[PDB]
Design a protein around this nucleic acid. Structure first.
Ligand SMILES: Nc1ncnc2c1ncn2[C@@H]1O[C@H](C[C@@H](N)CC[C@H](N)C(=O)O)[C@@H](O)[C@H]1O
Ligand SMILES: [Ca+2]
Length: 749
DNA sequence: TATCCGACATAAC
DNA sequence: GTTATGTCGGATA
């Protein structure tokens, strides 16, 4: 038998596409030419064509140099559209063996292409594999393999695993369809009504890619529909009559896709799955049943789902489910076209440009279903739209429109079976206009593991079981606390930064420069006790900088890099090329908080730093911080706050003054409570000192953390918890919920 | 001025 | 290539 296809076959087929593209067979013809070939490869390996008829024809009626191949394929494409009654009586016997196929797939005449030896062999190469068991992974890898890395990233062109679609469609509709099936399966009447209900269901993916959500869904429906016909069978031991019993078909699936090639795959993907299932039902009940020629057609539109009215694809009143995996694009990574798309959907809302592109599909869906509250929706999305600065900008608008979250998958790692897996963490948000009396939140122990369904009273805009209050960005703290500041941002392409060895090479080469070096600490250098230096030129005497060539060359390298920038303020900054782009350095010693750091720690390692070391923008800091405040930011309570209202990078903690610290509710303490927290603070500090040559990473890894440090932190929480009057169960659940009662009491005043 | 963020970036097994 | 865990500067206000 022939080797079944794997991912390497789709990738090879993709190279055929780009090989054809490079000789000028471009555009619409190219996309449909290839998807036609795909159908032929599947067809000869099933019973649509006689076994291997396509391959044999190419091998016997086509020249080895590939010179004539495209002529014969062009006539083949015409035959497959010509019913047998309209074929020339003298048509080549070998060509006459091919069935009439028709359908939107073969109706358009196409310019003939041109092949050579290697393109012919590549296509015969594809023929020799078995296309019989073609799956989402194949359709997705093919879709992905024709795209530049920059394109793949920017359209979010990442196909969705079988597994990730199943976590989305099982709660959305599928599981309930199996419960309902099992309850009526023994009543011929109710089973008949159940079939008609299955036939009338429509599925709508407004960013459908290569169609996997539609393909998996249609396959599950076909599988269900087999057991339904098994049920209904009133002929006992006679062969079940499929053609007049079957109903479900591709005309129930609808999709929008901006690139034509995935929009063409999605269509053929649905027909191949159709035939795959027709063969499977033909096996169960032993009688041959195929839907050839292609009389039913999906409704995939090639368009821009953010610029059109979805009702042109599918009238809302005739629609049932909206599902899919829309593209993820950060606020500062999106092209002028997609920012404008984003802003069209959100109108004149404040800071709406700060949303991920994926957020755009939510108000669209929310406006679309306003005319039919029976629709239920679910979207994969980057977990970022449930964290930090975006929660305030997306969920006020969604809640105001009636949108209610009915189930949700919390953060998990992305993956699929194709090349170049993207590195992003995800959520799944099921929503609609009807509250559900049984909301489930699926939780993950291993970010890579399988989920566990947990009952939920309510589902937060953060996807938590709690109240619907959102923590908003603030420029100053709601509590009585000293202001916090952002570290200095260099924008220097590294020209002002050095390793110790570099600082030594540079000093010997330019000894007059020692006066201008100062210690440089980012988050990574501080957490890990690594040494780094910067040239600190804020307020340098120009008579001293003229003397020094090596420095002058750095200042010129900063300026040249800064002019090449694309952000006008950066270009502007090129004309002060010896000063950091943003400067915040204090005059007093300060408390440093790293910006981005491992979620595996129970506390964010913070600490005190000398006023002469320059802190990078990968950190925050409080100038002249009394020990009490170091206790407060060390506390479980603060870190629980940071964990819940802060943002994340994939999943690492990301601190930010305006989201965490400034919204942090904190009651001012007595003199005894204040002295207590100070005493624990010094106990933590001392506990750290007693371990030379341990970096803060080594000390705050909770595996390797010394018990003497854990105790001082336990001493500290007790003092801070006392200031709150917090007596509750000492869990992240009870602490989060209690801080939000405090936050709301303050935000109500 | 003043950032939050990254279908990530990249040094380390 | 996996695994572990934080840079750097854009875009916007
Ligand atoms: N404005 C847009 N309108 C319509 N489609 C878009 C738009 N932006 C990106 N896309 C497409 O969104 C898709 C995102 C993918 N994650 C979908 C893949 C698809 N779920 C699959 O399983 O294969 C890409 O295929 C894009 O071409
Ligand atoms: Ca074959």
């Amino acid at each position: 038998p022939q080797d079944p296809i794997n991912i390497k076959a789709a990738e090879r087929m993709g190279k055929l596409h780009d090989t054809l593209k490079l000789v000028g067979y471009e555009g619409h013809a190219l996309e449909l030419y290839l998807v036609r070939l795909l159908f032929c490869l599947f067809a000869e390996d099933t019973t649509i064509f006689e076994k291997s008829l396509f391959q044999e024809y190419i091998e016997t009626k086509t020249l080895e140099d590939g010179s004539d191949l495209a002529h014969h394929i062009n006539t083949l494409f015409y035959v497959l559209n010509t019913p047998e009654q309209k074929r020339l009586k003298n048509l080549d016997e070998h060509l006459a063996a091919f069935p009439y196929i028709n359908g939107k797939l073969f109706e358009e005449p196409l310019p003939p292409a041109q092949f050579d030896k290697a393109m012919r062999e590549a296509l015969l190469d594809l023929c020799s594999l078995d296309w019989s068991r073609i799956s989402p992974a194949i359709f997705g890898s093919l879709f992905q393999s024709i795209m530049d890395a920059k394109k793949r990233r920017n359209l979010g062109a990442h196909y969705t695993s079988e597994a990730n679609i199943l976590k989305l469609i099982k709660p959305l509709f599928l599981d309930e369809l199996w419960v309902e099936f099992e309850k009526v399966k023994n009543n011929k009447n109710k089973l008949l009504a159940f079939h008609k209900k299955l036939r009338g269901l429509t599925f709508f993916d407004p960013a459908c890619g290569c169609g996997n959500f539609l393909v998996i869904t249609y396959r599950e429906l076909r599988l269900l529909e087999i057991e339904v016909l098994r049920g209904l069978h009133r002929g006992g031991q006679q062969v079940l009559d499929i053609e007049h019993l079957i109903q479900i078909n591709v005309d129930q699936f609808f999709g929008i896709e901006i690139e034509e090639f995935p929009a063409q795959i999605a269509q053929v993907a649905l027909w191949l799955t159709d035939h795959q299932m027709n063969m499977k039902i033909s096996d169960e009940f032993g009688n041959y049943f195929a839907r050839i020629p292609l009389k039913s057609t999906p409704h995939i539109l090639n368009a821009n789902a953010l610029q059109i009215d979805w009702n042109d694809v599918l009238e809302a009143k005739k629609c049932c489910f909206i599902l899919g995996n829309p593209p993820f694009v950060g606020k500062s990574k999106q092209t002028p076209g997609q920012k404008a798309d984003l802003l069209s959907v959100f109108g004149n809302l404040k800071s709406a440009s700060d949303l991920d592109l994926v957020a755009a599909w939510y108000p669209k869906a929310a406006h679309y279903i306003q005319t039919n509250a029976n629709i239920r929706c679910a979207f994969v999305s980057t977990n970022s739209i449930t964290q930090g600065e975006q929660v305030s900008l997306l969920w006020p608008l969604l809640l105001s429109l009636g949108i209610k979250i009915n189930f949700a998958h919390r953060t998990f790692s992305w993956t699929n079976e194709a090349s170049g897996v993207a590195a992003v963490h995800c959520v799944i948000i099921g929503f609609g206009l009807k509250d559900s009396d049984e909301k489930i939140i699926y939780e993950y122990e291993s970010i890579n593991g399988e989920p566990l369904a947990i009952k939920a009273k309510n589902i937060n805009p953060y996807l938590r079981d709690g109240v619907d209050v959102i923590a908003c960005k603030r420029q100053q703290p709601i509590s009585k606390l000293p202001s916090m500041r952002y570290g200095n941002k260099p924008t220097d392409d590294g020209n002002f930064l050095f390793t110790d060895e570099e600082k030594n090479q540079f000093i010997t080469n330019e000894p007059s420069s020692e006066k201008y070096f100062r210690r440089f600490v980012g988050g990574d250098e501080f957490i890990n006790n690594t040494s780094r230096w910067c040239l600190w030129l804020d307020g340098a005497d120009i008579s001293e900088i003229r003397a020094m060539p090596l420095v002058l060359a750095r200042i010129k390298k900063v300026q040249e890099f800064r002019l090449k920038s694309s952000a006008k303020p950066t270009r502007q900054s090129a004309s002060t090329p010896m000063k950091f782009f943003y400067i915040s350095q204090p005059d007093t010693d300060y408390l440093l908080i790293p910006e981005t750091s491992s979620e595996n720690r129970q506390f964010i390692p913070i600490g005190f730093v000398d006023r002469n070391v320059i802190s990078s923008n990968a950190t925050y800091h409080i100038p002249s911080a009394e020990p009490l405040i170091f206790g407060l930011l060390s506390s479980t309570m603060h870190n629980c706050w940071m964990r819940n209202v802060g943002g994340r990078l994939e999943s690492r903690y990301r601190y930010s003054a305006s989201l965490v610290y400034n919204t942090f509710p904190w009651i001012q303490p007595n003199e005894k409570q204040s002295k207590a927290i100070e005493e624990a603070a010094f106990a933590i500090l001392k506990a750290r000192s007693n371990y030379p040559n341990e970096s803060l990473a080594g000390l705050y890894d909770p595996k390797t953390m010394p018990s003497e440090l854990l105790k001082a932190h336990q001493k500290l929480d007790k003092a801070v918890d006392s200031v709150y009057g917090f007596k509750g169960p000492n869990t992240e659940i009870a602490r989060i919920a209690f801080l939000f009662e405090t936050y709301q009491k303050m935000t109500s005043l």
